[PDB]
Design an enzyme around this catalytic site. Structure first.
Site, PDB file in Angstrom:
ATOM      1  N   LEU A 134       0.871  -1.305   0.095  1.00 59.06           N
ATOM      2  CA  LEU A 134       0.092   0.026   0.274  1.00 59.06           C
ATOM      3  C   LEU A 134       0.680   1.194   0.033  1.00 59.06           C
ATOM      4  O   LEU A 134       0.260   2.304  -0.521  1.00 59.06           O
ATOM      5  CB  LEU A 134      -1.066   0.041   1.303  1.00 59.06           C
ATOM      6  CG  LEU A 134      -2.384  -0.701   1.146  1.00 59.06           C
ATOM      7  CD1 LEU A 134      -2.832  -1.402   0.049  1.00 59.06           C
ATOM      8  CD2 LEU A 134      -2.362  -1.671   2.318  1.00 59.06           C
TER       9      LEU A 134
ATOM     10  N   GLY B 241       5.509   3.552   4.500  1.00 55.55           N
ATOM     11  CA  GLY B 241       5.911   3.883   5.861  1.00 55.55           C
ATOM     12  C   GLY B 241       7.244   4.195   6.002  1.00 55.55           C
ATOM     13  O   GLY B 241       8.004   4.312   4.987  1.00 55.55           O
ATOM     14  N   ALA B 242       7.792   4.382   7.387  1.00 55.33           N
ATOM     15  CA  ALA B 242       9.004   4.943   7.295  1.00 55.33           C
ATOM     16  C   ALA B 242      10.073   3.904   8.114  1.00 55.33           C
ATOM     17  O   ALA B 242      11.217   4.290   8.328  1.00 55.33           O
ATOM     18  CB  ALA B 242       8.857   6.211   8.409  1.00 55.33           C
ATOM     19  N   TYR B 243       9.426   2.878   8.326  1.00 58.18           N
ATOM     20  CA  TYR B 243       9.850   1.918   9.328  1.00 58.18           C
ATOM     21  C   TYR B 243       9.941   0.413   8.484  1.00 58.18           C
ATOM     22  O   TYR B 243      10.774  -0.129   8.446  1.00 58.18           O
ATOM     23  CB  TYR B 243       8.803   1.910  10.496  1.00 58.18           C
ATOM     24  CG  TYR B 243       8.059   3.144  10.853  1.00 58.18           C
ATOM     25  CD1 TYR B 243       7.100   3.378   9.555  1.00 58.18           C
ATOM     26  CD2 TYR B 243       7.941   3.864  11.636  1.00 58.18           C
ATOM     27  CE1 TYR B 243       6.088   4.351   9.723  1.00 58.18           C
ATOM     28  CE2 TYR B 243       6.899   5.204  11.683  1.00 58.18           C
ATOM     29  CZ  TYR B 243       6.119   5.147  10.802  1.00 58.18           C
ATOM     30  OH  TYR B 243       5.234   6.451  11.120  1.00 58.18           O
ATOM     31  N   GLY B 244       8.567   0.307   8.019  1.00 52.58           N
ATOM     32  CA  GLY B 244       8.529  -0.799   7.051  1.00 52.58           C
ATOM     33  C   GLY B 244       7.710  -0.165   5.880  1.00 52.58           C
ATOM     34  O   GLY B 244       7.637   0.865   5.714  1.00 52.58           O
ATOM     35  N   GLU B 245       7.081  -1.182   5.340  1.00 50.40           N
ATOM     36  CA  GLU B 245       6.166  -0.968   4.304  1.00 50.40           C
ATOM     37  C   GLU B 245       4.770  -1.475   4.974  1.00 50.40           C
ATOM     38  O   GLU B 245       4.595  -2.164   6.152  1.00 50.40           O
ATOM     39  CB  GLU B 245       6.257  -1.705   3.157  1.00 50.40           C
ATOM     40  CG  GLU B 245       7.396  -2.629   2.851  1.00 50.40           C
ATOM     41  CD  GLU B 245       7.396  -3.842   1.770  1.00 50.40           C
ATOM     42  OE1 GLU B 245       7.182  -4.831   1.831  1.00 50.40           O
ATOM     43  OE2 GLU B 245       7.176  -3.432   0.482  1.00 50.40           O
ATOM     44  N   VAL B 246       3.738  -1.392   4.344  1.00 48.54           N
ATOM     45  CA  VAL B 246       2.312  -1.849   4.797  1.00 48.54           C
ATOM     46  C   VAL B 246       1.723  -2.388   3.570  1.00 48.54           C
ATOM     47  O   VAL B 246       1.917  -1.924   2.546  1.00 48.54           O
ATOM     48  CB  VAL B 246       1.345  -0.539   5.025  1.00 48.54           C
ATOM     49  CG1 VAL B 246       0.144  -0.983   5.653  1.00 48.54           C
ATOM     50  CG2 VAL B 246       1.924   0.692   5.572  1.00 48.54           C
TER      51      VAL B 246
ATOM     52  N   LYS C  15       1.294  -3.903   8.911  1.00 49.82           N
ATOM     53  CA  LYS C  15       2.120  -2.847   8.924  1.00 49.82           C
ATOM     54  C   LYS C  15       3.516  -3.643   9.542  1.00 49.82           C
ATOM     55  O   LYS C  15       3.332  -4.159  10.733  1.00 49.82           O
ATOM     56  CB  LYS C  15       1.776  -1.876   9.963  1.00 49.82           C
ATOM     57  CG  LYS C  15       2.802  -0.851  10.405  1.00 49.82           C
ATOM     58  CD  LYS C  15       2.380  -0.144  11.509  1.00 49.82           C
ATOM     59  CE  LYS C  15       3.037   1.361  11.791  1.00 49.82           C
ATOM     60  NZ  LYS C  15       2.339   2.373  12.614  1.00 49.82           N
TER      61      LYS C  15
ATOM     62  N   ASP D  15      -0.353  13.240  16.819  1.00 46.12           N
ATOM     63  CA  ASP D  15       0.231  13.448  15.503  1.00 46.12           C
ATOM     64  C   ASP D  15      -0.948  13.442  14.328  1.00 46.12           C
ATOM     65  O   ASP D  15      -1.152  12.786  13.321  1.00 46.12           O
ATOM     66  CB  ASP D  15       1.372  12.363  15.022  1.00 46.12           C
ATOM     67  CG  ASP D  15       2.226  13.051  13.880  1.00 46.12           C
ATOM     68  OD1 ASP D  15       2.930  11.831  13.442  1.00 46.12           O
ATOM     69  OD2 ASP D  15       2.226  14.016  13.822  1.00 46.12           O
TER      70      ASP D  15
HETATM   71  O1  LIG Z   1       0.523   3.689   6.535  1.00 41.51           O
HETATM   72  C1  LIG Z   1       0.200   3.272   7.669  1.00 41.51           C
HETATM   73  O2  LIG Z   1       0.982   3.285   8.748  1.00 41.51           O
HETATM   74  C2  LIG Z   1      -1.009   2.437   7.757  1.00 41.51           C
HETATM   75  N1  LIG Z   1      -1.574   2.488   6.250  1.00 41.51           N
HETATM   76  C3  LIG Z   1      -2.724   1.989   5.792  1.00 41.51           C
HETATM   77  N2  LIG Z   1      -3.500   1.187   6.686  1.00 41.51           N
HETATM   78  C4  LIG Z   1      -4.833   0.761   6.592  1.00 41.51           C
HETATM   79  N3  LIG Z   1      -5.188   0.704   5.437  1.00 41.51           N
HETATM   80  C5  LIG Z   1      -4.619   1.435   4.420  1.00 41.51           C
HETATM   81  O3  LIG Z   1      -4.936   1.463   3.169  1.00 41.51           O
HETATM   82  C6  LIG Z   1      -4.012   2.509   2.605  1.00 41.51           C
HETATM   83  C7  LIG Z   1      -4.030   2.723   0.789  1.00 41.51           C
HETATM   84  C8  LIG Z   1      -5.198   2.787   0.594  1.00 41.51           C
HETATM   85  C9  LIG Z   1      -5.487   2.906  -1.024  1.00 41.51           C
HETATM   86  C10 LIG Z   1      -4.342   3.311  -1.755  1.00 41.51           C
HETATM   87  C11 LIG Z   1      -3.109   3.454  -1.218  1.00 41.51           C
HETATM   88  C12 LIG Z   1      -3.048   3.180   0.096  1.00 41.51           C
HETATM   89  C13 LIG Z   1      -2.907   2.485   3.304  1.00 41.51           C
HETATM   90  C14 LIG Z   1      -1.652   3.275   3.348  1.00 41.51           C
HETATM   91  C15 LIG Z   1      -1.272   4.455   2.682  1.00 41.51           C
HETATM   92  C16 LIG Z   1      -0.186   5.261   2.533  1.00 41.51           C
HETATM   93  C17 LIG Z   1       0.955   4.699   3.064  1.00 41.51           C
HETATM   94  C18 LIG Z   1       0.967   3.511   3.601  1.00 41.51           C
HETATM   95  C19 LIG Z   1      -0.267   2.730   3.703  1.00 41.51           C
HETATM   96  C20 LIG Z   1      -3.357   2.126   4.730  1.00 41.51           C
END
Ligand SMILES: O=C(O)CNc1ncnc2oc(-c3ccccc3)c(-c3ccccc3)c12
Length: 257
Positions: free
Chosen positions: A10, A13-18, A33, A116
């Site tokens: 998705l 993140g700054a730490y890992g990916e999601v 996460k 935040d």
């Molecule tokens: O980034 C986080 O810490 C949790 N992130 C999320 N958690 C729970 N659901 C999600 O849907 C997303 C998402 C949805 C549609 C398109 C792109 C991303 C994201 C998303 C967003 C930006 C960076 C990382 C992830 C997301």
């Protein structure tokens, strides 16, 4: 019923990916996460249960790695619904703000501050319902009914309240209120008012001097702007509180079907 496919990343993140994970049987989707402060995040998440707060389902120890299992929010970030220099329609902004107050009222009622609040951390589900996300910096500000003051600076400079840069200790709740205000300003203007709320910051001095004939304020409109006048008060002891934001005229103005 067990067994999940990682189906895309998705974001970074700054730490890992999601990662988006889907269930091979049920087709249920979850965000995963990955972490290579994290114990407290998990601990706080376990406490939380509300419609405008990203659901925590569980977590996997797996060797060194920590896997965090959270609500998938297919709408992405509120950040991406804000048009640079425009914002969004006012009825959309108002709905998002209602839901953000619901989420923040919930946290504060259980003694939690997120610390935040910003559109990057406000995620949206399939129906554009707003979910508060990332308790990575969150902490307990009330326990057994007794408030503890904060003294550690964190957050994100354009959304941080002034007292957090000026004072050794400061109340948690007015800081989250201030940042909701910057989030409102953004949604209605497409634009952040200052790099930080420091008296070394011209845009902040201009606002304290009341020059609302300048941007971003001039894009805004006197009902939401008046509410912004009560949120963005330098003195946190004088700042409007949530129960009273709820009594605000614009907050209560019908706009959206
Ligand atoms: O980034 C986080 O810490 C949790 N992130 C999320 N958690 C729970 N659901 C999600 O849907 C997303 C998402 C949805 C549609 C398109 C792109 C991303 C994201 C998303 C967003 C930006 C960076 C990382 C992830 C997301």
């Amino acid at each position: 019923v067990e067994d999940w496919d990682l189906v895309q990343t998705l974001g970074e993140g700054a730490y890992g990916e999601v990662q988006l994970a889907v269930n091979r049987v049920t087709e249920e989707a979850v965000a995963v996460k990955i972490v290579d402060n994290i114990k407290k995040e998990i601990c706080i998440n376990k406490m939380l249960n509300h419609e405008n707060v990203v659901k925590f389902y569980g977590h996997r120890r797996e060797g060194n790695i920590q896997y965090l299992f959270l609500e998938y929010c297919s709408g992405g970030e509120l950040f991406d619904r804000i048009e640079p220099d425009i914002g969004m329609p006012e009825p959309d902004a108002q709905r998002f703000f209602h839901q953000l107050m619901a989420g923040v009222v919930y946290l504060h009622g259980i003694g939690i501050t997120h610390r935040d609040i910003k559109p990057e951390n406000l995620l949206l589900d399939e129906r554009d319902n707003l979910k508060i996300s990332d308790f990575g910096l969150a902490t307990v500000f009330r326990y057994n009914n007794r408030e503890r003051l904060l003294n550690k600076m964190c957050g994100t400079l354009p959304y941080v309240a002034p007292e957090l840069l000026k004072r050794r200790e400061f109340h948690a709740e007015p800081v989250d209120v201030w940042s909701c205000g910057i989030v409102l300003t953004a949604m209605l203007a497409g634009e952040l008012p200052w790099d930080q709320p420091s008296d070394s910051c011209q845009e902040y001095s201009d606002w304290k001097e009341k020059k609302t004939y300048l941007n971003p304020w001039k894009k805004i409109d006197s009902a939401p702007l008046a509410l912004l006048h009560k949120i963005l008060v330098e003195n946190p002891s004088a700042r409007i509180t949530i129960p009273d934001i709820k009594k605000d005229r614009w907050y209560n103005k019908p706009l959206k079907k």
